[PDB]
From a paper:
ATP-hydrolysis-coupled [name] polymerization is a fundamental mechanism of cellular force generation. [name] polymerization powers fundamental cellular processes, including cell migration, organelle dynamics and endocytosis. After incorporation into F-[name], subunits rapidly hydrolyse bound ATP in seconds. F-[name] polymerization is coupled to the G-to-F transition, a substantial flattening of the [name] subunit that renders its nucleotide cleft active site competent for hydrolysis.
As reported protocols for preparing ADP-Pi–F-[name] vary, we validated our approach (polymerizing G-[name] in the presence of 15 mM KH2PO4) by monitoring cofilin severing using a fluorescence microscopy assay. We therefore used cryo-EM and iterative helical real-space refinement as implemented in RELION to determine the structures of ADP–F-[name] and ADP-Pi–F-[name] at resolutions of 2.4 Å and 2.5 Å, respectively. In both nucleotide states, extensive water-mediated hydrogen-bonding networks stabilize the ligands. At the helical-lattice level, the refined rise was slightly larger in ADP–F-[name] (28.1 Å versus 27.8 Å in ADP-Pi–F-[name]), which accumulates into detectable differences in subunit positioning at longer length scales. Water positioning in this channel was largely similar between ADP–F-[name] and ADP-Pi–F-[name]. Consistent with previous reports, ADP–F-[name] rapidly depolymerized within 5 min of cofilin addition, whereas ADP-Pi–F-[name] largely remained intact. Despite extensive ordered solvent differences in the nucleotide cleft, these structures feature nearly identical lattices and essentially indistinguishable protein backbone conformations that are unlikely to be discriminable by [name]-binding proteins.
Author numbering:
A (entry chain B), B (entry chain C), C (entry chain A): 5 to 375
The structure:
Amino acid sequence: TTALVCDNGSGLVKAGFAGDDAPRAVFPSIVGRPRHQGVMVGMGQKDSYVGDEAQSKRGILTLKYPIEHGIITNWDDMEKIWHHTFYNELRVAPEEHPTLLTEAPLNPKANREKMTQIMFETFNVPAMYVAIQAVLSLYASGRTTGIVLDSGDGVTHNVPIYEGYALPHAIMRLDLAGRDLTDYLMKILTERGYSFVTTAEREIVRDIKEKLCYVALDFENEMATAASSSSLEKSYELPDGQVITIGNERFRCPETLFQPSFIGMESAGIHETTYNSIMKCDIDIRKDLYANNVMSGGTTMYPGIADRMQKEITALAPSTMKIKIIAPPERKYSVWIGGSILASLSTFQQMWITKQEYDEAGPSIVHRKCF
Amino acid sequence: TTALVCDNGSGLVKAGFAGDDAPRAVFPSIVGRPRHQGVMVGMGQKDSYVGDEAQSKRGILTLKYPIEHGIITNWDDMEKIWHHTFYNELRVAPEEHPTLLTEAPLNPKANREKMTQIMFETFNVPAMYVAIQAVLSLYASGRTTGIVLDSGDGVTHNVPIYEGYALPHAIMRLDLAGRDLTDYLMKILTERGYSFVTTAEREIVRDIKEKLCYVALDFENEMATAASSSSLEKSYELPDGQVITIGNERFRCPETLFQPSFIGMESAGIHETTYNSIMKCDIDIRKDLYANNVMSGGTTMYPGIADRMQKEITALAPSTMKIKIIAPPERKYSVWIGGSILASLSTFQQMWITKQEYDEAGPSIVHRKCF
Amino acid sequence: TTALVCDNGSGLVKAGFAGDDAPRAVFPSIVGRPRHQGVMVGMGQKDSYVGDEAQSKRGILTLKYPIEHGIITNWDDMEKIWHHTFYNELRVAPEEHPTLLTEAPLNPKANREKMTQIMFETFNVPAMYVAIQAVLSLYASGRTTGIVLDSGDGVTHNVPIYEGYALPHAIMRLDLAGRDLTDYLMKILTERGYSFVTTAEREIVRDIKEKLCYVALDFENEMATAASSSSLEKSYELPDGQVITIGNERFRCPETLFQPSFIGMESAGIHETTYNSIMKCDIDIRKDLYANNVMSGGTTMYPGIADRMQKEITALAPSTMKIKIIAPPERKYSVWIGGSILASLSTFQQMWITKQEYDEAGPSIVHRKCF
Ligand SMILES: Nc1ncnc2c1ncn2[C@@H]1O[C@H](COP(=O)(O)OP(=O)(O)O)[C@@H](O)[C@H]1O
Ligand SMILES: Nc1ncnc2c1ncn2[C@@H]1O[C@H](COP(=O)(O)OP(=O)(O)O)[C@@H](O)[C@H]1O
Ligand SMILES: Nc1ncnc2c1ncn2[C@@H]1O[C@H](COP(=O)(O)OP(=O)(O)O)[C@@H](O)[C@H]1O
Ligand SMILES: [Mg+2]
Ligand SMILES: [Mg+2]
Ligand SMILES: [Mg+2]
């Protein structure tokens, strides 16, 4: 049989079949419900919308994310999204395909316990497995050694791995990702008179961020350049025809990744977090870690972020060390690619958690059989 | 057939074929096991590593020496190391080659009894012999008269030999060698803020000791010079790019050989030990012993140690006696060279302990046929 | 004149006058600076806060420890804390009172050199002395023989003393103490969905650890009991009214003292460390050392830790030896009590380092006149 790989991210859902190069279904992980009363009978009206249908009708819906900071908060909507993924997007029967799921490190245990329970009861999957997202990214990188910086919509985390061995004590996790940057961009757009308060407007600001934001090599010099002339100004057309122009907000929004104090957080930036994760490892592997910095996720797709990370790590690392940032063009799907590679391995087939084992042991078996 | 010579030291393993000038396989006598859990499947993961493979992966392994103070303490790891030496390093079948083994004097009898049993049962060697390390050094020196000071990683011992006759009552043994100096250097490096606590860091400190330590002709004058200026300061680059600077610790570490009280030991120094060994011999051979002081082993490779030993022995010996310290440049392999010379001798071929004799007599035959 | 005793620990500062039974000033060794911008003028706003004032306003401050692992890392904040201790807490003039300072063994020399320089220049103290913390604990125990296990917030160390004589070669030091346990508890609280990332939240987790953690006599049996029922579960009320419940984390956090591998460290536990320290001493004093195990410091205040240590040492020691763990109820201030006792001794008054001697010799005199 063919195995299923499902990367349930905070923002997007990636699904497909093991052995493929790219996921087949990529749709937003949103559930939308009407906030206005219907007046016209005879047309199909649903109580909820999932995914692209929710995005298309977002003008009359309230959009709610069931996953927040890599933690599932609404299990009803999560089950709806899983049903949608299994039936309307993949056109498969979950009872005939083992499914591989992903999760961020340092997550609550009940999250994966309930994921296993839902998989084994609601959908009757013959076997399932929960992997750590950064490990899959390293699988997709074709490497057994390196520190992975995976930053998506909810969670930014660091996992150092050397010769296939992970160092759990050096694992870093920070709840600062694309959604926080979108909210900060919404906050800072009010300085030019642009107001976005609803969820659909949040989806518009997210699109603006995806299409106009970039990371500046030097923040203060970029600010001076923006305050000096209008070369950095760009225009964006709203869906109603309105045109907005933004200046320094293009690079101020992703600067929060390196200066978390912009949103009131006391934590250090991603570069200092990676440096601290490297320094917590054994001294004999830091040289290999310095040259194998792997970035994955949507939040790593900002233009010029790899150069900024390389500059900061070089400024933090000793001069004799060689710093190399690895940013493949397809890093937005590295987790799914690595999951498919893992599920397509012959040696992995003995690591599946089957229905009989779950019945014998209960939901607690996921802690034993999964890292 | 060709005979095998194996010098199983506390720190290093020297192996080769009788008749050669240098051993062919020289690798550390360490067994390393992972102390972290693997996360990446599909790659070759072994439960243990032996030798250079353990040194290369020491960042994720715990390193254990199976031989401590010239005494085998872990026979499982010792058998693993012997298997590695026989198969992966020499590429020979032990059933077709007589092997010559080495041992420090005044060792427990069970050590060589179990060595003989392992050789005759696990590897089915046709014949084996156990020699005293210091005698072999005298063989490699091309001498039949002299007192040998052999100091390796575990044991420092003195064996006076005159005209091919040894004096067992004058044999000295002291459990103070390179490993103790490495531990003392680790202890004293904390005075400059440098912390090394793990086994891999111990291997780093051992390398630092090998590359930066030297013996001072006058300890107090050297201390005053070090406290006066920075001429004695030198820098070392850690594997992660960090740079450390050490001053008086360069000559304080090997000073423990002459002042054992630095590590809390009540025994006398190597010079006084050699003088006492000489004085316990007959008065008519002391003149020949004074001029034939032979040094062998890695711990005798410190710069300026021969001059210090000569000065101390001259200060202890009568003025009319002539003191000459013999420190060949290749004394790190003198034991192996002498073992090969002994195994290449025609008259020695009748001294082998064969399988039939061991079967008739048992492990106790090594006490009768070996000194 | 009256002598001052100041135990500058990693976590807390203990100060008072020689001859007293308890220190008069006990406040946290923290310096806090605002991380938000002020908006209301006319009120007293300070650039930094020290001690209890920093604890009270920790919601708008970033808290930094100037002492890390018994080593002073921020001398500006350390000088601020010393000024606070001298003036706002003790209400004394440092120029009129000799001060006694404490330090952990195997510390960098520059630490105490700079401590002496600051005492003799910034505060113009007429005389000062630096003692080893564990020796003072033995003074407070009313003993001249015994091995002291002192574990505070930064350093856990062992010092064996027999008949007033210390054995430096058997002194153990391990950088695993209450702060590491607090960080591990912060890491493991994420399994139940509780997130603490800021310094103030670290102070909250430290309080939770102090009020709810205990050492289990049998770790595996305790884990089975916790996984079987809810008898071990307890509740804690957060300062904002939130209530959290923890189960096995109560005894998993202090288990790191006996299993350092939980935080990725390769070192052995405190029981094995004490056993190795005892075994490195002379065979004729081990019997007296076995019956005089003295514990001091905040990290020794966990319920049931003395019984666990006694069980482990009995399992390691020979059956005919008698193991007695000495855990006085006031061991959180044993270092300060012993310092006051030492400073109140007539024979000690000739061991003070005076201003004239420091001027003649410089900062290097502390190495000669202090152990
Ligand atoms: N080109 C881009 N530039 C900046 N941010 C992007 C880009 N593409 C996607 N993102 C952001 O990355 C996040 C989604 O990436 P993804 O790795 O799919 O997250 P998740 O795994 O949580 O679904 C969103 O916050 C999105 O706004
Ligand atoms: N150049 C050197 N200077 C100082 N010590 C050395 C040097 N080379 C080797 N050593 C020490 O000698 C010991 C190993 O020497 P060796 O004679 O091979 O010992 P063994 O026979 O016990 O293996 C190690 O402790 C090593 O640190
Ligand atoms: N009742 C308790 N249980 C567990 N840990 C405690 C308790 N009381 C204090 N501690 C811990 O001990 C440390 C402080 O003790 P102390 O001996 O004063 O350390 P220091 O000398 O480094 O200031 C802190 O980590 C604190 O959390
Ligand atoms: Mg993701
Ligand atoms: Mg040797
Ligand atoms: Mg203390």
